[PDB]
Amino acid sequence: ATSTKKLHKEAATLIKAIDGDTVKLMYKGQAMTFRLLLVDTAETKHTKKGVEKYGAEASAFTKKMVENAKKIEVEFDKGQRTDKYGRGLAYIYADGKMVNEALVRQGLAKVAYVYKGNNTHEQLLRKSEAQAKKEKLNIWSEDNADSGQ
């Protein structure tokens, strides 16, 4: 029937965000480290300054959106529940809103890469990224492909 998509988010409360995608969410009464699946919110691992690709803004938007939302819900797909980091791989939702979409659609988070298991929302994820890429919002506003050489 395809009536029960069972794709309803659910968690409890967000303690605090670490790096946009990595946030400590209190689920079932326990504060576990959650990670936005199929998304990337900042990856400052070069030590340039903190604005090479809206890395500082990525966490800020997700941090303020979660701490301000008051209600956070997570959705675990078929992908691995722990990306070899004992974390909680899944999509983040604030007050019934899509964080991943808002981030990518706004230009704060890009599209991650799941080996297998997590590829259900890969349709909307790629769409939001493409729109931000072609339009060059923020994250995709400094990724000159340089067609040539």
Side-chain angles (χ1 to χ4, degrees):
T2 308
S3 30
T4 304
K5 295 105 62 255
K6 75 259 279 268
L7 283 181
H8 63 271
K9 52 260 141 199
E10 191 190 87
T13 297
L14 173 278
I15 298 96
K16 233 214 111 102
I18 311 177
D19 271 291
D21 52 66
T22 319
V23 301
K24 271 216 100 150
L25 223 147
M26 201 188 236
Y27 181 101
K28 82 118 210 206
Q30 68 159 227
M32 64 197 288
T33 321
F34 272 83
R35 258 254 202 161
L36 256 163
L37 256 180
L38 278 183
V39 198
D40 234 28
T41 336
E43 185 131 81
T44 35
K45 49 108 114 142
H46 219 345
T47 326
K48 203 206 281 186
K49 46 111 74 71
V51 190
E52 50 166 87
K53 65 247 256 100
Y54 285 85
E57 198 117 41
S59 53
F61 169 32
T62 315
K63 172 224 220 154
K64 58 111 141 220
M65 181 160 239
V66 301
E67 293 238 272
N68 195 343
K70 317 215 141 216
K71 179 232 253 195
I72 307 76
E73 285 188 317
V74 299
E75 177 183 44
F76 276 91
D77 241 33
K78 264 70 134 164
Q80 61 209 126
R81 205 200 236 166
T82 75
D83 206 35
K84 314 275 219 208
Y85 284 115
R87 309 230 199 281
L89 270 185
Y91 291 86
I92 308 293
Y93 303 83
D95 203 86
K97 176 144 204 156
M98 268 172 121
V99 187
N100 48 311
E101 288 212 319
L103 285 148
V104 187
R105 180 154 140 161
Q106 287 259 74
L108 270 306
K110 56 117 133 220
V111 188
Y113 283 135
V114 183
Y115 314 129
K116 55 144 153 284
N118 224 77
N119 267 301
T120 307
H121 301 71
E122 214 220 33
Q123 311 194 66
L124 42 136
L125 285 140
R126 217 206 191 79
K127 240 97 259 215
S128 206
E129 181 221 340
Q131 301 231 230
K133 215 298 103 168
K134 312 138 98 210
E135 289 220 340
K136 304 256 222 140
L137 281 155
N138 276 358
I139 54 183
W140 305 131
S141 218
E142 60 99 52
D143 183 84
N144 207 344
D146 215 298
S147 175
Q149 311 149 226

